[PDB]
Amino acid sequence: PALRLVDPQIQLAVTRMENAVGRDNVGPKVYPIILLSLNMARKTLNKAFQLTPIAVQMTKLATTEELPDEFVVVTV
Amino acid sequence: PALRLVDPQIQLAVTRVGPKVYPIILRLLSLNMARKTLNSLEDKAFQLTPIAVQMTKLATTEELPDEFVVVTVK
């Protein structure tokens, strides 16, 4: 009931073990995201985790022409 | 509420340049791979494929990697 394209700066890397010796060989690939908060994290002190938020800009879609040939849907 | 280590086979690629990938962790849904594939003679339809999202409950915080991302649902 709600659709929008996540800015290409953020894409999902996907892998499937089940189709290694099975297929042929799907690899690890990055795919755009179609649709909360997110934070990128790092180690600082002895156990401490710094994090900074990354702003996810999205573009609302209207035409199916905007939809690429390979992407990933994520529902909320 | 505990955090969830997301399947490392599923990792987030951040470019914003330095394109690096990071594990995903969850604070508290579905996932659909979408390819064209469906040929036909005039127009190409879309093949959807749900992927199994296998999360594991995190034991100790020492298990966390030095670089990762956290996503919040509600």
Given in angstroms, what resolution was this structure solved at? 2.8
Question: Is residue A12 situated within a structural domain?
Answer: yes
- Contact (CB<8Å) A13/B11: yes
Q: Residue A56 domain-assigned?
A: yes
Residue-wise over B21-50: b if at least 16 C-beta within 10 A, else e?
bbbbbbeeeebebbeeeeeeeeeeeeeeee
Is residue A20 one of the residues assigned to a domain? Answer: yes
Instruction: Report the distance separating Cα A70 and Cα B19, nearest Å.
Output: 19
A67 lies in a domain?
no
Q: Please tell me the distance from the alpha carbon of residue A3 to that of residue A23, in angstroms, as a whole number.
A: 31
Number of CB atoms found within 10 A of residue B15's CB: 13
- In this complex, is the C-beta atom of A4 within 8 Å of any C-beta atom belonging to chain B? no
Technique that determined the structure: X-ray
Distance from CA of B5 to the nearest CA of A (A): 14
Domain interval for residue B66: 4-72
